[PDB]
């Protein structure tokens, strides 16, 4: 919708700003290492994050809740989210 901008920090904090005013709204703290990818679905309901810890977290943007947590074998490096199909590909370190 062009209203929210997500910024991923190297210390594991995901911040959400509002584009039209540039005022901070919310801040998610799950990863303990650097977050290397953020994406939000087309419906602006489910949010997904990935970090060098190798963990992928599933957040519900509307209610601000942690839907589920997934751990992979290797650190994650980059992410692409396909909004039409709800598939996202992670470039793992292995």
């Amino acid at each position: 919708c062009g209203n929210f901008g997500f910024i991923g920090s190297s210390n594991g904090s995901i911040t959400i700003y509002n584009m039209q005013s540039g005022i901070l709204r919310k801040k998610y703290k799950l990863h303990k290492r650097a977050v290397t990818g953020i994406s939000l679905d087309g419906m602006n309901r489910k949010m997904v994050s990935c970090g060098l810890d190798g963990i992928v977290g599933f957040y519900d943007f509307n209610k601000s809740t942690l839907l589920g947590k997934l751990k992979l074998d290797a650190p994650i490096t980059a992410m692409v989210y396909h909004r039409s199909s709800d598939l996202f590909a992670l470039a793992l370190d292995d």
Binding site: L24, R25, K26, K27, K29, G57, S64, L66
Partner: peptide
């Protein structure tokens, strides 16, 4: 996992 909406 913590979500913070009020920073002041």
């Amino acid at each position: 996992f913590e979500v913070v909406e009020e920073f002041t």
